[PDB]
Design a protein around this ligand. Structure first.
Ligand SMILES: *[C@H](C)[C@H]1/C(=C/c2[nH]c(/C=C3N=C(/C=C4\NC(=O)C(CC)=C4C)C(C)=C\3CCC(=O)O)c(CCC(=O)O)c2C)NC(=O)[C@@H]1C
Ligand SMILES: *[C@H](C)[C@H]1/C(=C/c2[nH]c(/C=C3N=C(/C=C4\NC(=O)C(CC)=C4C)C(C)=C\3CCC(=O)O)c(CCC(=O)O)c2C)NC(=O)[C@@H]1C
Ligand SMILES: *[C@H](C)[C@H]1/C(=C/c2[nH]c(/C=C3N=C(/C=C4\NC(=O)C(CC)=C4C)C(C)=C\3CCC(=O)O)c(CCC(=O)O)c2C)NC(=O)[C@@H]1C
Ligand SMILES: *[C@H](C)[C@H]1/C(=C/c2[nH]c(/C=C3N=C(/C=C4\NC(=O)C(CC)=C4C)C(C)=C\3CCC(=O)O)c(CCC(=O)O)c2C)NC(=O)[C@@H]1C
Ligand SMILES: *[C@H](C)[C@H]1/C(=C/c2[nH]c(/C=C3N=C(/C=C4\NC(=O)C(CC)=C4C)C(C)=C\3CCC(=O)O)c(CCC(=O)O)c2C)NC(=O)[C@@H]1C
Ligand SMILES: *[C@H](C)[C@H]1/C(=C/c2[nH]c(/C=C3N=C(/C=C4\NC(=O)C(CC)=C4C)C(C)=C\3CCC(=O)O)c(CCC(=O)O)c2C)NC(=O)[C@@H]1C
Ligand SMILES: *[C@H](C)[C@H]1/C(=C/c2[nH]c(/C=C3N=C(/C=C4\NC(=O)C(CC)=C4C)C(C)=C\3CCC(=O)O)c(CCC(=O)O)c2C)NC(=O)[C@@H]1C
Ligand SMILES: *[C@H](C)[C@H]1/C(=C/c2[nH]c(/C=C3N=C(/C=C4\NC(=O)C(CC)=C4C)C(C)=C\3CCC(=O)O)c(CCC(=O)O)c2C)NC(=O)[C@@H]1C
Ligand SMILES: *[C@H](C)[C@H]1/C(=C/c2[nH]c(/C=C3N=C(/C=C4\NC(=O)C(CC)=C4C)C(C)=C\3CCC(=O)O)c(CCC(=O)O)c2C)NC(=O)[C@@H]1C
Ligand SMILES: *[C@H](C)[C@H]1/C(=C/c2[nH]c(/C=C3N=C(/C=C4\NC(=O)C(CC)=C4C)C(C)=C\3CCC(=O)O)c(CCC(=O)O)c2C)NC(=O)[C@@H]1C
Ligand SMILES: *[C@H](C)[C@H]1/C(=C/c2[nH]c(/C=C3N=C(/C=C4\NC(=O)C(CC)=C4C)C(C)=C\3CCC(=O)O)c(CCC(=O)O)c2C)NC(=O)[C@@H]1C
Lengths: 172, 221, 162, 172, 172, 162, 162, 162, 172
């Protein structure tokens, strides 16, 4: 697998060189943010169940037909899958967020996803939608927690977004 | 003109009690299975080569019990020829067979069944009571098919014999993660090369015979 | 590549569960340590060269016959290689310090080490000396945890080589 | 596995010594007989089917009960197994005969067999009987071939016997 | 599995009770030693190869016969196993040392080891001996490192011993 | 143990079939060859000692430094071992000639070779020379097929060592 | 042994579930049929002997040469066996009618049929005639469903034999 | 296809190892035998026809009833087939002699033998006689090892048929 | 598998005929060469290790970049593979040489190899080169032995070449 650190290494390796001092300073500062980074993750994981639950409700209020006979979220069996999937995607996103790198998300999770959806006849559009719905809810928590030292998390927040979006895009 | 020559006779002299190498194997009659030959299906396989994998698979996967003409599973082994299914998929089809159920599961208790599935699916015996419980729960949620599928799809099965290799006895030699009890319990599950896991003597399969092992305290050091 | 962070992800992933407190605790560990690790890397990176010269050299003192004609240590090409190689070892070590795991070492250096060495008749022994000599020098420029870290990784190789 | 040669080696090994000149001369001689040895084997293999067929007939004429309901050779399924077993035993014996050593026979074939037989309820005595019946028929062929150069096979014949007997004994 | 902390928990659980303040103070102090504990482990792992190498040399100098033809460490294949085993035992010991609990060691490593050795015919006494030889060498390192803050490790040293000894005993 | 005879049995046995003509042909091969093989063994067995001395010696010429104090070649114990070891190689080779297969070699010598050698820091190189030197001597006492056989087995080890 | 009842249990058991309506429906089928089945068995059981004589006989008409000396049909022992055997077939058939499944047939007769027959050189053909002749006679003593059942099982064997 | 040469390759290949002395010995065996084998094939190939006539014929003497109308032996088509078939057996045998293994026989003749024969109601017995009669004739045109070889293969079929 | 003999058979079979007298004479001749054939094989197997070792050295002296960071033989892990592959190809070649037929080589080894190499980014050119380097060294031994009866091996030598070349071509 990969993550922020490992990645920089690998680059350096192909040049055949020790890490540039400049490059260290990327990592040095990356470390400093750790604590923020962690809390971000913690927030998602802590609220996981809810994030999903929420997103789903909204998804089904919008696209009533999914839950009607003949739709893709009907019957129970299917519904279940749909929920499960949402969650997975989320799980991965979180992983990425910790790693500080999209890779894990792309390779384990997003790779092949579109095609699956296609083959089944699952409507990719709707899937993507769900992912966004999730995104917004999630940020909600990341950004409004309890007992955390007040400070600026924007940087992390945006990176979070991106991950969600890579997901949305590749599925869609 | 070398001449000094340290004698080196003493090193050559035989031990007080000597064993041939492979004496340990010849006692315990694990000689045949200890290092165990792997059979692999290869590309553009000949007609005799496939016949040999089938022969092997039915010996390991089935128990060393006797497969009569009637017993054989025509459709599964036709697919194995012409590479529709891999040997890993061939094994899965064998494991879900009236024939596999009739022997093994239908007469056995779930403890004896799960302990048999370990062995035929993977040479090892069960390392711990947890493993037994894990499978027994799986069966109660999701039934015999998911139970079987869990061994063949297990990471351990895939790493030693991913696809294309018929399962062999990995027990009786040290396997990473093994846990002691490996060697001891495998000797109980594996009789001689004449022995088999049959029910024909008296309809029922015997009782588990690894329940008391698996739950023994460590002897006061 | 095996680093603290990747592993916990892996473990989480296998069981199929979210990263819970258990794993984050672990991650936190990696990050706290980093400060020391990073320091060590800056120190090795800077003195690289000098460490390398010293090592290569050492090896020859330790095994004089290598420099005789018809041997491996003999003729510049070989010396060049010898240098190159040690550089590598060092390079990777730094990497591993920064990555916070043996990962980098395992995949570049260790995996396939034996067979390479066998086929080209490189004696592990040599490398080892190189490393040891290094370790000794590093044991001056560094101190406290930074030092400790440096050692760990250096050793890790010694053990893999032997 | 093991055979005549390998065996002698192993012995020598425990003494820790090079092979005795005397001992070589055992092997040297053993080689010389090869041709005889081979033909012997060839004779069995060539007649295999029949050897069995024959033995069986006689076995069942003697021990009528085996084939009666309640006996061990009834019904078909059981009968079939019994025939298979006879063949296996024979097969091994042959193997041994070639090797010039009991081992192979003892380990693969005889090892565990008694216990199995017990568990099944199969009457060991009858099994043994069968083995003998086979023995006699087999020797019959070994000893009376056609188109082979005439000479003395006794030595081989006796060794053959022994193998059969080891079988009989360990089963019984 | 189990370790120092988990263990105390479990005890508390059967009483059905919150942890005693006294009991916390065990754990509190256990934490304080961590750093020492860690270094100890680090020392073993760092020297692993050597520890073994060493112990072996000494083992074979003492019990010459093991390496004589017909002995248990002869020939190569056997020797290899013997080395492998040593390593394993060591590996476990280390694990325990970190956990702060014998359990892990007892369950995976020790339990049934004796019986195995018996079945193989490997001489249990010699195995035990090896384990001790290892012990002494190992302690050697634990106790004499370089660049560590000087202080008292005894407590840890003794616990290390015990682990080795449990091993020795149960094998023997 | 892998000899011609054992193998065909094994193969026959796996398929579950009687030894048919196919296998006997093979066996016949082993027996015809034996005469040459056996001859070779008688020759090695007789000159054993002398071969051993010569080899050990050679190694030291090839690697003078071994005999210096603080090295492996130094001090009688080590020399004794060195002798012993080579004896073994030879011993087994003879065995294999007679058994008509690599079997004896594989099971005694080859299996576990690497790790043993690694853990005790025996350099394959050494052994090799020993063997080569031997091969050269044997290349006088023997001739024609007998010789050919001797070589085969000797080499087999060289390749396993390297 | 495969009967309707055993199977549904088995299927229920595999899935790990209680017997639900699905299976009971099936069972019910078996029980209602039984009345006919049972009737058929009473009829065969009674006329057994006569059926057997007739069959054996038939076979000889069909294959005169069997009765010639040096053949298999020749000499009373063989005739006795021939009788015995057919008795068996019949016996089992009755069983199967009563058990309400092929089970009894499969396990006694069918499994191993081929090999037995091969090794003793019993020609399936013979048996078949026996059966056919039987079937024809049974086609008088019975009628309607009872008959139908009888046939099914009789045939089942024909197919297994052929 | 199973010949000596293919097998040793296969075995070598499975283990993942080079062909060592063990296997070559075996191969050598095959080649030495060949001279005799080849001779035998030349002899059968030449007398083919005559052997076939004789055999077919024999079968009819042995089983007179076959030639009666409404039987299998009756009417030319069948006789033609009968001839064809035996030709085949012979053909393959020659092949196997030359290939130096049962291979050719196994794949053409033996595999599927049973079922074919069952479905078309060919009695193994017949074939067997054919073969035996042949064997007897061959027992004149050949002698010594050539003969021995011929037999082996002929028998191999007898056993497979029975 | 297939080999020279079996092949001829198969052809003959489809014609439906006994072997042509002409065709026998191919095989008859083939037998005569056997001894030569064998020695050839023996020579390769005996020198295997070396052949490779040698070829490699030369390969890397030429294409320095393979062993530079970013090249395909770097790092160790990859290097190892590269060596392993060379060997395999050799192994097969030998097999073929004995069989007297390319097949085995083509089917087990060469088939698909190009594409694999491509997908990985292994430079097929270089692979081919290696194969040749091997070829020359190998012939070297085949053609210059000691203690073999002197005579002409050319015929075999050329066939050997061809095998190597099939390899080179299909990879390239
Ligand atoms: C939910 C927002 C939408 C939805 C989902 C849905 N998915 C399935 C079935 C599957 N979905 C997956 C998902 C994955 N495959 C992967 O590799 C990964 C990443 C690692 C995921 C997340 C897969 C494998 C399946 C097929 C197998 C399965 O049983 O899940 C369904 C059911 C399809 C069916 O016909 O049974 C559904 C409904 N579809 C919707 O309606 C939502 C918009
Ligand atoms: C960001 C989305 C929000 C935010 C984050 C934030 N956190 C801190 C500081 C810390 N957060 C943690 C949390 C952890 N550290 C760990 O080791 C673990 C795993 C067990 C966690 C969950 C810690 C320890 C710190 C340091 C001490 C502290 O809590 O102050 C800050 C302060 C700045 C910093 O980087 O330290 C901030 C800003 N606060 C916000 O305003 C966002 C909503
Ligand atoms: C025949 C002469 C006598 C006879 C034998 C008999 N055996 C069985 C059943 C089994 N026999 C074996 C034995 C072997 N398996 C092996 O691999 C070997 C050689 C290494 C042997 C000898 C086994 C394992 C079985 C069980 C078969 C299975 O798993 O289904 C029976 C049948 C008993 C049954 O009900 O299956 C019989 C009859 N018994 C006689 O009465 C004859 C004297
Ligand atoms: C230095 C202590 C001694 C020495 C070394 C030396 N090395 C080679 C050749 C190689 N060295 C390596 C090592 C690596 N290559 C890698 O990719 C890595 C991982 C990053 C390592 C550690 C390799 C693979 C080679 C083989 C071929 C190559 O070109 O690299 C040589 C040349 C030996 C030869 O047979 O070509 C030498 C001599 N030189 C000295 O003077 C010391 C004794
Ligand atoms: C012994 C039971 C009967 C007997 C045997 C006998 N055989 C020979 C000689 C040979 N037999 C063979 C047979 C083979 N050699 C092989 O390589 C193979 C496998 C391909 C076989 C089947 C050979 C080649 C010989 C040599 C030539 C020959 O036929 O004579 C003898 C002669 C003595 C000797 O030492 O060879 C004998 C006695 N003859 C009997 O009367 C026994 C009943
Ligand atoms: C070395 C100190 C002594 C020695 C060791 C020795 N062991 C074997 C063989 C085996 N060793 C084991 C041991 C283990 N299995 C486990 O699960 C564990 C950890 C939980 C261990 C430590 C096993 C299973 C074997 C048998 C299979 C295998 O080889 O892997 C041997 C070889 C004996 C044999 O005949 O196989 C030896 C020599 N014996 C000595 O002489 C030393 C005193
Ligand atoms: C005991 C065998 C030896 C010893 C130990 C000792 N260590 C310390 C202090 C520390 N040890 C470490 C080591 C680590 N901390 C970690 O997080 C890790 C894993 C990455 C390690 C390896 C650390 C960081 C400390 C704190 C700073 C320091 O090194 O001092 C002490 C100091 C007292 C204490 O209670 O910790 C001691 C005594 N000293 C001995 O006598 C032996 C040589
Ligand atoms: C001779 C070229 C060099 C040399 C050798 C030497 N060997 C050892 C120790 C061992 N050598 C072997 C080799 C074998 N022992 C076996 O059982 C087998 C298989 C039959 C072989 C090939 C072994 C296993 C050992 C280790 C066990 C032991 O104690 O002997 C030594 C001593 C090594 C040490 O560190 O004590 C030596 C020195 N001596 C020379 O002079 C040459 C350089
Ligand atoms: C009758 C149509 C022909 C005939 C038959 C005949 N059968 C045998 C021998 C056997 N027949 C059977 C049949 C069964 N035995 C069983 O256990 C079962 C399953 C319940 C069946 C169907 C068996 C197994 C045998 C072999 C053992 C035995 O001795 O009974 C023979 C004797 C063959 C021999 O070689 O001695 C014969 C002749 N006889 C006729 O007249 C018809 C041609
Ligand atoms: C001769 C002994 C008796 C005989 C023979 C006969 N055979 C058939 C039909 C077939 N015979 C074979 C045999 C082979 N075909 C093959 O492919 C092979 C292997 C290469 C063999 C040995 C086959 C397959 C058939 C069926 C296909 C076909 O018939 O063409 C018949 C025809 C019977 C029928 O059509 O039902 C006959 C009559 N007839 C005699 O005269 C002898 C008693
Ligand atoms: C060809 C590349 C070189 C060459 C070969 C050559 N060999 C022989 C003769 C023989 N070589 C062998 C070899 C074997 N026979 C076996 O059974 C085995 C495996 C165990 C081997 C290795 C044998 C036995 C012979 C026959 C007797 C002899 O003394 O050689 C010849 C002579 C011609 C012939 O075919 O008999 C030749 C020419 N000679 C060269 O100069 C080539 C470089």
């Amino acid at each position: 697998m990969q993550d922020a650190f490992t990645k920089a290494i690998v680059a350096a390796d192909l040049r055949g060189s020790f890490l540039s001092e400049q490059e260290l300073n990327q990592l040095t500062n990356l470390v400093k943010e750790s604590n923020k980074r962690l809390d971000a993750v913690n927030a998602i994981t802590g609220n996981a169940a809810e994030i999903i639950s929420d997103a789903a409700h909204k998804l089904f209020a919008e696209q009533t037909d999914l839950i009607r006979p003949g739709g893709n979220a009907y019957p129970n069996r299917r519904m279940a899958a749909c929920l499960r999937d949402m969650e997975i995607i989320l799980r991965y996103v979180s992983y990425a967020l910790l790693a500080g790198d999209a890779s894990v998300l792309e390779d384990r999770c997003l790779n092949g996803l579109k095609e699956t959806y296609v083959a089944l006849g699952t409507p990719t559009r709707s899937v993507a939608r769900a992912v966004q719905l999730m995104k917004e809810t999630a940020i909600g928590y990341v950004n409004s927690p309890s007992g955390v030292t007040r400070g600026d998390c924007s940087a992390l927040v945006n990176e979070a977004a991106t991950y969600f979006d890579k997901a949305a895009a590749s599925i869609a | 003109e070398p001449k000094r020559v340290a004698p080196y006779a003493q090193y050559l002299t035989p031990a007080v009690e000597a064993t041939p190498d492979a004496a340990a194997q010849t006692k315990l009659g694990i000689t045949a299975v200890a290092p165990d030959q792997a059979v692999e299906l290869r590309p553009n396989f000949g007609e005799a080569e496939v016949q040999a994998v089938i022969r092997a698979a039915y010996k390991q996967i089935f128990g060393n019990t006797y497969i009569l003409e009637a017993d054989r599973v025509v459709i599964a082994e036709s697919l194995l020829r012409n590479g529709s299914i891999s040997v890993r998929e061939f094994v899965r089809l064998l494991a879900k067979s009236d024939l596999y159920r009739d022997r093994f599961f239908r007469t056995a208790s779930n403890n004896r069944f799960i302990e048999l599935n370990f062995k035929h699916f993977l040479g090892r015996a069960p390392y711990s009571q947890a493993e037994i419980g894990e499978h027994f729960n799986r069966y109660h949620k999701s039934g015999y098919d998911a139970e079987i599928d869990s061994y063949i799809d297990s990471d351990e099965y895939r790493r030693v014999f991913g696809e294309n290799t018929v399962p062999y006895f990995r027990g009786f030699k040290y396997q990473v993660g093994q846990a002691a009890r490996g060697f001891d319990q495998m000797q109980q599950l594996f009789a001689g090369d004449a022995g088999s896991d049959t029910d024909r003597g008296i309809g029922a399969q015997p009782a588990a015979k690894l329940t008391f092992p698996l739950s023994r305290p460590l002897g006061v050091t | 590549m095996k680093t603290v962070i990747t592993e916990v992800i892996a473990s989480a992933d296998s069981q199929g569960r979210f990263l819970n407190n258990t794993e984050l605790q672990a991650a936190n560990g990696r990050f706290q340590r980093a400060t020391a690790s990073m320091e060590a890397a800056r120190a090795l990176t800077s003195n690289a060269d000098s460490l390398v010269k010293g090592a290569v050299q050492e090896v020859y003192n330790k095994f004089p016959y290598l420099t005789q004609p018809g041997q491996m240590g003999y003729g510049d090409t070989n010396q060049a290689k010898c240098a190159r190689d040690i550089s590598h070892y060092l390079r990777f070590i730094t990497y591993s310090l920064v990555a916070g795991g043996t990962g980098p070492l395992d995949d570049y250096i260790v995996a396939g080490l034996r067979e390479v060495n066998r086929t080209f008749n490189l004696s592990p022994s040599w490398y080892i000396e190189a490393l040891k000599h290094i370790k000794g020098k590093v044991g001056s420029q560094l101190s406290g945890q930074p030092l400790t870290e440096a050692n760990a990784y250096i050793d890790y190789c010694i053990n893999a080589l032997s």
